[PDB]
Amino acid sequence: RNLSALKRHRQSLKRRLRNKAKKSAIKTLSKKAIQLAQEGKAEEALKIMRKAESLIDKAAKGSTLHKNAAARRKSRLMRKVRQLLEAAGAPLIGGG
């Protein structure tokens, strides 16, 4: 009745924690930054936007995000922030 498949399930549970955890933050922040950029609030948007971009590429280092997801996530972030600022402008920090 036993296995080390058990072990393998034991671990999956734990990786799952770190993953979910990581993806939550990425969404929390992009949203936070898109939210700012709508009412922009130019400098602050861009500030958080970097903090997302960091967090994205950081998840992409491992198994959480496939690198293209990171690419895709990042692309859609920047597109949103910028085009939001165009209803008002102008970009306070970097970037870019």
Partner RNA sequence: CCCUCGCCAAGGAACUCUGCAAGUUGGCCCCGUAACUUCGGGAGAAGGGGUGCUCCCUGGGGUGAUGAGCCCCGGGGAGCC
Partner RNA sequence: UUGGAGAGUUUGAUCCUGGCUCAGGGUGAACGCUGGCGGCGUGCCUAAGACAUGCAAGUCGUGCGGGCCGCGGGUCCGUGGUCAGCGGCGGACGGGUGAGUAACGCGUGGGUGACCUACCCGGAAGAGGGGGACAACCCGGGGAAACUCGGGCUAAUCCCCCAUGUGGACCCGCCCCUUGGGGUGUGUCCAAAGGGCUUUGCCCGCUUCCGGAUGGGCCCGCGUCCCAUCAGCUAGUUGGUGGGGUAAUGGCCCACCAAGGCGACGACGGGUAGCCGGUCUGAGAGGAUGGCCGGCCACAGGGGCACUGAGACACGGGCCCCACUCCUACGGGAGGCAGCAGUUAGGAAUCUUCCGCAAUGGGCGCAAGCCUGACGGAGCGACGCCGCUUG
Partner RNA sequence: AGCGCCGGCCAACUCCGUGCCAGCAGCCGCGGUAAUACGGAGGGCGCGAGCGUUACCCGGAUUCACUGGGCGUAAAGGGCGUGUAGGCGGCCUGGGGCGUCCCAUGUGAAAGACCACGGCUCAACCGUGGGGGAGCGUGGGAUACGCUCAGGCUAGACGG
Partner RNA sequence: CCGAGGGUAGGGCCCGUGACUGGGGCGAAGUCGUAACAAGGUAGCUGUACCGGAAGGUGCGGCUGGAU
Among residues 10, 66, 76, 79, which is the contact residue for Mg ion, using CB under 5 A? 66
* Interaction of residue 67 with Mg ion, rule CB under 5 A: yes
* Interaction of residue 53 with RNA, rule CB under 7 A: yes
**Could you give the C-alpha distances from 1 to 9, 38, 51, 80, in angstroms and in order?**
15, 58, 48, 54
Rounded Cα–Cα distance for residues 44 and 25 (Å) = 17
* Interaction of residue 4 with Mg ion, rule CB under 5 A: yes
- Read off the amino acid at residue 1: R
Contact positions toward RNA, by CB under 7 A? 1-16, 18-20, 50, 53-54, 56-58, 61-64, 66-72, 74-79, 82, 94-96
